Design a protein around this ligand. Structure first.
Ligand SMILES: O=c1ccn([C@@H]2O[C@H](COP(=O)(O)OP(=O)(O)O)[C@@H](O)[C@H]2O)c(=O)[nH]1
Ligand SMILES: [Mn+2]
Length: 272
């Protein structure tokens, strides 16, 4: 029964999962030690299983500005989890240059476009830097419908704020992201950019996929009021095809590959 053969696909669910994880933010983190403990993660925060081929080619995109301590917690907790999930992944921290109003959604678009320059990713996880999953059965990859990952956050009493809530951590396949023309680029702190994304998905006929809530629990790292759903549905229908990936503009000022992540510092302009 000999002969040259290809590596098998990785299994539907990884056999390496441990389930519940104790998440704490009260100790210091040293990235050199983290890299040493995660020796298989390559420069820029890249990893793929050695013994099987994952159909999950995932770019994990983190919107960022001055949250280095949270990032250190994110990297310390997520790298082991992502490897146990057997993903072919890369970590991208999209750092907003300057001191002007933060624009989360626009940095996420930047992440999608820049991660694609690196590799043919086919799934995109958009994750705030201060959310850590509490159970490794909460898969950080894409499904048949847009995936809402952080479904039961401790900050919201472990309950979904409203059925259309799509914030925190989500995953969209390349096909799913393209068909909604990405995310809006003009939410300069206004709030509700996640509701606009949800409206785009719905208008394109997509629904929300979610892990079972018991394994979808996440911890939020406190830093220096349950959200409510912002309207603007008509707005989204009016503007989604003209404001998004197609109209995205920015300047890349610095690209740094660190052992555990790639950081792209970009100038995304100011509110027009
Ligand atoms: O100065 C800032 C503001 C926001 N963020 C990123 O944006 C996410 C959400 O921002 P915030 O924690 O203020 O939550 P919001 O209330 O705006 O949902 C954070 O977790 C970070 O990933 C950041 O990096 N720096
Ligand atoms: Mn936060």
């Amino acid at each position: 029964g000999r002969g040259s053969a290809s590596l098998p696909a990785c299994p539907e669910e990884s056999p390496l999962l441990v389930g519940p994880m104790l998440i704490e933010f009260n100790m210091p983190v040293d990235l050199e030690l983290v890299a040493k403990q995660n020796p298989n993660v390559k420069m820029g925060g890249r990893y793929a299983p050695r013994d099987c081929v994952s159909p999950h080619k995932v770019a994990i995109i983190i919107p960022f500005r001055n949250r280095q301590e949270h990032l250190k917690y994110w990297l310390y907790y997520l790298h082991p989890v992502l490897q146990r999930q057997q993903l072919d992944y890369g970590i991208y921290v999209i750092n907003q240059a300057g001191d002007t109003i933060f624009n989360r959604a626009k940095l996420l678009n930047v992440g999608f476009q820049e991660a694609l320059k690196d590799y043919d990713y086919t799934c995109f996880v958009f994750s705030d830097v201060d959310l850590i999953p509490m159970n490794d059965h909460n898969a950080y990859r894409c499904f048949s419908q847009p995936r809402h990952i952080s479904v039961a956050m401790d900050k919201f009493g472990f309950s979904l704020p409203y059925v259309q809530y799509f914030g925190g951590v989500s995953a969209l396949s390349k096909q799913q992201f393209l068909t909604i023309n990405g995310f809006p680029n003009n939410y300069w702190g206004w709030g509700g950019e996640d509701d606009d994304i949800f409206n785009r998905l719905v208008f394109r006929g997509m629904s929300i996929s979610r892990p079972n809530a018991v394994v979808g629990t996440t911890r939020h790292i406190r830093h220096s009021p349950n959200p409510q759903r912002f309207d603007r549905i008509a707005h989204t229908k009016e503007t989604m095809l003209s404001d998004g990936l197609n109209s995205l503009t920015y300047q890349v000022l610095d690209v740094q590959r660190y052992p555990l992540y790639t950081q792209i510092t970009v100038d995304i302009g100011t509110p027009s």
